[PDB]
Design a protein around this ligand. Structure first.
Ligand SMILES: Nc1ccccc1N1CCN(CCO)CC1
Ligand SMILES: [Cl-]
Ligand SMILES: [Cl-]
Ligand SMILES: [Cl-]
Ligand SMILES: [Cl-]
Ligand SMILES: [Mg+2]
Length: 346
């Protein structure tokens, strides 16, 4: 067990191992500090969870986040560098700290500020799809892909972060907000049980924005956004209507006048024809018919970068805990076991 030291920073007590030095606050579910890790030479983010075990819902969310971060081991996905608690036993266990690489710029900064060549778009979207092939192979759905959840460094290398770990609130998704502009219509409107195909819809929205410099579907509310979507991809046919489970949602769709799919070459003027082709295969209304991550990596748009011997899949991921009903102290004990069994990366 390492030696810990205490200090108060912006009204919060931080108790951390001596290896972490020069803590500096940098910003819902916890507080974050930047620090220098003297054992590895890494510049890191240290997150202290806020009230991790205050309710059954919150204790299960703490366990879910720690299990997910411990599993992710891929070049294009955020990984876990360390996890610690100052507690010396389960009986005094109350605080959880998570350590990751400190991230600088996100894709928001790049799209708004830089001039991107087609080669930049190829490399950035290739890396998102490479990470998604890995994530989806473990039957994990990210659910919240958007530019602020994609970190990028000076060499245009990219990492996926901030997995969807709790339900977003109704208020967070209301109005003219980027939190909703990248969501697939079937989850935005609760049409049906969703699956991993929702993440490919988000990649299409991000790729369009890199090519034009503008948000693809900037709706002022749920219904305005749906109208923008259906004007581009067309209104649904009877085949997809069969798959919408809410009678009321089906009724609303049929109240709209029918519209054909638009010509994407006349929307994304001057783009690489291979980029136009890939966008038509991602932005498909019926989720059963969208291209998958593994299929998209083999598309000719990525011929410069595709290497099927360097696109790995994940170890199996057991999510059976998600249907388990436990007491707070039982979720807490499961979390404690995962903290003390952590083994750092090479
Ligand atoms: N590779 C990478 C890709 C996208 C965004 C950021 C980074 N690095 C991670 C490594 N770190 C240095 C050691 O703490 C600098 C940022
Ligand atoms: Cl230490
Ligand atoms: Cl990482
Ligand atoms: Cl503690
Ligand atoms: Cl964003
Ligand atoms: Mg985020």
């Amino acid at each position: 067990r390492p030696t810990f030291y205490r200090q108060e920073l912006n009204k919060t007590i931080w108790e951390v191992p001596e290896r972490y030095q020069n803590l500096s606050p940098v910003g819902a579910y916890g507080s974050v500090c930047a620090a220098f890790d003297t054992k590895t030479g890494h510049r890191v983010a240290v997150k202290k969870l806020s009230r991790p075990f205050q309710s059954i819902i919150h204790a299960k969310r703490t366990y879910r986040e720690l299990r997910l971060l411990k599993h992710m081991k891929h070049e294009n996905v955020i990984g876990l560098l360390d996890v610690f608690t100052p507690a010396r036993s389960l009986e005094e266990f109350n605080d959880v700290y998570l350590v990751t690489h400190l991230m600088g710029a996100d894709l928001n900064n790049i799209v708004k500020c830089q001039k991107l060549t087609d080669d930049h778009v190829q490399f950035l979207i290739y890396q998102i799809l490479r990470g998604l092939k890995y994530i989806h192979s473990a039957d994990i759905i990210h659910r919240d892909l958007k530019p602020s959840n994609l970190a990028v460094n000076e060499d245009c290398e990219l990492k996926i972060l901030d997995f969807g770990l709790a339900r977003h609130t109704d208020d967070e998704m209301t109005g003219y907000v980027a939190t909703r502009w990248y969501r697939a219509p079937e989850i935005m409107l609760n049409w049906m049980h969703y699956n991993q195909t929702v993440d490919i819809w988000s990649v299409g929205c991000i790729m369009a924005e890199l090519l034009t410099g503008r948000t693809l579907f900037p709706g002022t509310d749920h219904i305005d956004q749906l109208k923008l979507i259906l004007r581009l991809v067309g209104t649904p046919g009877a085949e997809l209507l069969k798959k919408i489970s809410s009678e009321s949602a089906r009724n609303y769709i049929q109240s709209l006048a029918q519209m054909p799919k638009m010509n994407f070459a006349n929307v994304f003027i001057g783009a690489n024809p291979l980029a136009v082709d890939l966008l038509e295969k991602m932005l498909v209304l019926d989720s059963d018919k969208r291209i998958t991550a593994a299929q998209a990596l083999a598309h000719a748009y990525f011929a410069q970068y595709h290497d099927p011997d360097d696109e790995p899949v994940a170890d199996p991921y057991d999510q059976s805990f998600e249907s388990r009903d436990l007491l707070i102290d039982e979720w807490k004990s499961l979390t404690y076991d995962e903290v003390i069994s952590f083994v750092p990366p090479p």
